[PDB]
């Protein structure tokens, strides 16, 4: 569910993301702005969420939102340098 | 539901927005990116949706999303001169 997934990313709720992924939720679904859970996590600087999505869920690391920004662009824009460097590995 | 609201604005579904507003839904509700129905409608150039939100629902014409953009900024970004003109009179 878009509401549940992207809000869980927004609040850093790794436990909820895990329940969703285990239940086979598509962790790459997008909202009306073409945003992903990874975009939102990276914009908030949620390191553990970003690592979970990338490593355990294998999500696309470079989705493009409606402004053509990637999660890495968002991390740099909002000052989350640790998240930025995590995404750099990809 | 903020996501139902914003998806209706995304697809230009004025009939759905009317049903929501009539049932006392808060039409100024924000998502995890601080986006409003008015932002999304303006980005998509949905003139009738924009005028319905402004004129019938009396929403704030200048909400600011996560990137500090207003619906007017989105109208401009996506080239919607017609939507820009509507917002300019506010
Ligand atoms: Na952090
Ligand atoms: Na800065
Ligand atoms: Na916030």
Swiss-Prot record, chains A, B:
Q: In which tissues is it expressed?
A: Isoform 1 and isoform 3 are detected in brain cortex. Isoform 3 is highly expressed in astrocytoma, ganglioglioma and ependymoma. Isoform 1 is highly expressed in brain and kidney, but not detected in liver. Isoform 3 is highly expressed in heart and pancreas, detected at lower levels in placenta, lung, pancreas and kidney, but is not detected in liver. Isoform 2 is expressed in cardiac and skeletal muscle.
Post-translational events: Synthesized as a 74-kDa cytosolic precursor which is proteolytically processed by the mitochondrial-processing peptidase (MPP) via a 72-kDa intermediate to yield the mature mitochondrial 68- and 65-kDa subunits.
- Mark the ANK repeats by their residue spans: 33-62, 67-90
Coiled-coil features, chain-numbered ranges: none
Instruction: Copy the domain comment.
Output: The C-terminal ANK repeats prevent the assembly of the supra-tetrameric filaments. A highly mobile activation loop at the dimer-dimer interface is important for enzyme activity.
Question: Which family, according to the similarity comment?
Answer: Belongs to the glutaminase family.
Q: What disease involvement is noted?
A: Developmental and epileptic encephalopathy 71: A form of epileptic encephalopathy, a heterogeneous group of severe early-onset epilepsies characterized by refractory seizures, neurodevelopmental impairment, and poor prognosis. Development is normal prior to seizure onset, after which cognitive and motor delays become apparent. DEE71 is an autosomal recessive form with onset at birth. Death occurs in first weeks of life. CASGID syndrome: An autosomal dominant disease characterized by infantile-onset cataract, erythematic subcutaneous nodules, profound developmental delay, self-injurious behavior, and intracerebral glutamate excess. Histopathologic analysis of skin lesions show deep perivascular and periglandular lymphohistiocytic infiltrates and pronounced leukocytoclasia at the surface of the dermis, focal vacuolar alterations, hyperkeratosis, and parakeratosis of the epidermis.
Q: How does it assemble?
A: Homotetramer, dimer of dimers. The tetramers can assemble into rod-like oligomers (in vitro), but the physiological significance of this is not clear. Interacts with RAF1 and MAP2K2. Interacts with ATCAY; the interaction is direct and may control GLS localization, negatively regulating its activity.
Instruction: Relate the protein's function as given in its record.
Output: Catalyzes the first reaction in the primary pathway for the renal catabolism of glutamine. Plays a role in maintaining acid-base homeostasis. Regulates the levels of the neurotransmitter glutamate, the main excitatory neurotransmitter in the brain.
Name listed for the protein in its UniProt record: Glutaminase kidney isoform, mitochondrial
Query: What range of the full-length protein does this chain span?
Result: 553 to 642 of 669
